[PDB]
Write a protein that binds this ligand. Structure first.
Ligand SMILES: CC(=O)Nc1cccc(-n2ccc(=O)c(-c3ccnn3-c3ccccc3F)n2)c1
Ligand SMILES: [Cl-]
Ligand SMILES: [Mg+2]
Ligand SMILES: [Zn+2]
Length: 313
């Protein structure tokens, strides 16, 4: 009960910032997550014994892939921590509980392949879940782990609170399907602009939580340039492996996934910043002003990629 987690001074201070990098010491990441739960939620939200057992089972069920791995899980959870801490009074106790867990679990058992590759391969999961294929699998994996003996971190919640938090977690994980982001952000853009955005409207909160999930999921593009640039390598290592597997199915991959077209990555990054990342953080900053540093950091990285093209690096 009186057992706090305490980080070294540099981490204690920098973990509060949006651009925090969780570092290369894997064995400190569970402790970093618990620290964030305790400050974001309370030392009472979860039983430490059950939480620690849940975290280590989640870790085991992430695969050794270049990008969609345990480090991504904890990175995405830290961005959500930074959003929640900078918007103290806007979120319920259940929401803060649900969303950190949703972020830790959002890519459970990822193989490093897109929904499109699963469908073209004719993977069994594509027959089970026709849309948001991997995201329905990630939620399924989350429910499976919660149901292991001694792993139900929500046990002290009432029956209705339990149904609510699992519904927050389901919608949050489904919302990390980037195919769904484009329409979600458009709707939020319309609602903010016409003044009809109402955070007491559950359908509206759901949409805002959706956008927070996209923002946390993409947060590699909101780090300092050296982190963003080095993470790009891991992201493209998966894209190129998927490209190889498309060629093995007798399909020419889109240039983004073709390792013969590495020359075109810098211009491909501009499109992604301009079509996806900047619009995401812009709409997020409009709804939640204290998340502005994500947009500023994203714009700085856009400027760095422009410099790569202009041959200045
Ligand atoms: C451009 C478009 O319209 N669609 C699209 C679709 C999927 C991927 C990317 N893509 C390209 C370049 C990147 O750096 C990233 C990117 C940056 C941080 N995270 N992701 C990311 C990685 C894997 C899966 C989804 C992700 F969002 N994503 C673009
Ligand atoms: Cl891979
Ligand atoms: Mg995902
Ligand atoms: Zn993800």
């Amino acid at each position: 009960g009186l057992m706090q987690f305490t980080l070294p001074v540099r981490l204690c201070k920098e973990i509060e910032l949006f651009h925090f990098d969780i570092g290369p010491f894997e064995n400190m990441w569970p402790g970093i997550f618990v620290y964030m739960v305790h400050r974001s939620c309370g030392t009472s939200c979860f039983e430490l014994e059950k939480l620690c057992r849940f975290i280590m089972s989640v870790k085991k069920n992430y695969r050794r892939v270049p990008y969609h791995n345990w480090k991504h899980a904890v990175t995405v959870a830290h961005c959500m921590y930074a959003i929640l801490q900078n918007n103290h009074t806007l979120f319920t106790d259940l929401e803060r509980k649900g969303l950190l867990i949703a972020c830790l679990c959002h890519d459970l058992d990822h193989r490093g392949f897109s929904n499109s590759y699963l469908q073209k391969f004719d993977h069994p999961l594509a027959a089970l879940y026709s849309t948001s294929t991997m995201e329905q699998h990630h939620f399924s994996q989350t429910v499976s782990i919660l149901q292991l003996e001694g792993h139900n971190i929500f046990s002290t919640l009432s029956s209705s609170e339990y149904e609510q938090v699992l519904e927050i977690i389901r919608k949050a994980i489904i919302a990390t399907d980037l195919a769904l982001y484009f329409g979600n952000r458009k709707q939020l853009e319309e609602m903010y602009q016409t003044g009809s955005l109402n955070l007491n409207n559950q359908s509206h909160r759901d949409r805002v939580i959706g956008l927070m999930m996209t923002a946390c999921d993409l947060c590699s593009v909101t780090k300092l340039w050296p982190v963003t640039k080095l993470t790009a390598n891991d992201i493209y290592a998966e894209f190129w492996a998927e490209g190889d597997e498309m060629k093995k199915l007798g399909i020419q991959p889109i240039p983004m996934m073709d390792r013969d077209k590495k020359d075109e990555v810098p211009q491909g990054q501009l499109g992604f910043y301009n079509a996806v990342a900047i619009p995401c953080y812009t709409t997020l900053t409009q709804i939640l002003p204290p998340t502005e540093p994500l947009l500023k950091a994203c714009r700085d990285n856009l400027s760095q990629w422009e410099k790569v093209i202009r041959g200045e690096e």
